[PDB]
RNA sequence: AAAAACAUUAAAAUGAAACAGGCGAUUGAAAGAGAUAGACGGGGAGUUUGGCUGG
């Protein structure tokens, strides 16, 4: 009955998934309104 | 640097860690473009290159 059990993954010479926000290229109006706040704080 | 190979649509009970007010670097208050001033500039523009006179 030992067929269904745990199976860990690889991710060596293989791929690995991860969330990639902070890299999204938001529209020009979002970028402008986000960097505007920074200029107020710098 | 032993091997011209495979690697994806997950099991299982999150797996696959969080946060930053920076996509990652480089240059930097200098340099580019503007204005004014000096230099240089036949690369180019405009023009000139007297008269008498045994032609």
Automatic annotation (TrEMBL):
Domain of life: Eukaryota
Family: Belongs to the eukaryotic ribosomal protein eL8 family.
Protein name, per record: 60S ribosomal protein L7a
Record's function text: Component of the ribosome.
Organism: Entamoeba histolytica (strain ATCC 30459 / HM-1:IMSS / ABRM)
Signal peptide residue numbers: none
């Amino acid at each position: 009955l030992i067929v269904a059990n745990k199976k860990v993954f690889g991710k060596g010479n293989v791929a690995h998934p991860r969330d990639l926000t902070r890299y999204v290229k938001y529209p020009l109006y979002v970028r402008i309104q986000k960097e505007k706040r920074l200029l107020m704080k710098r």
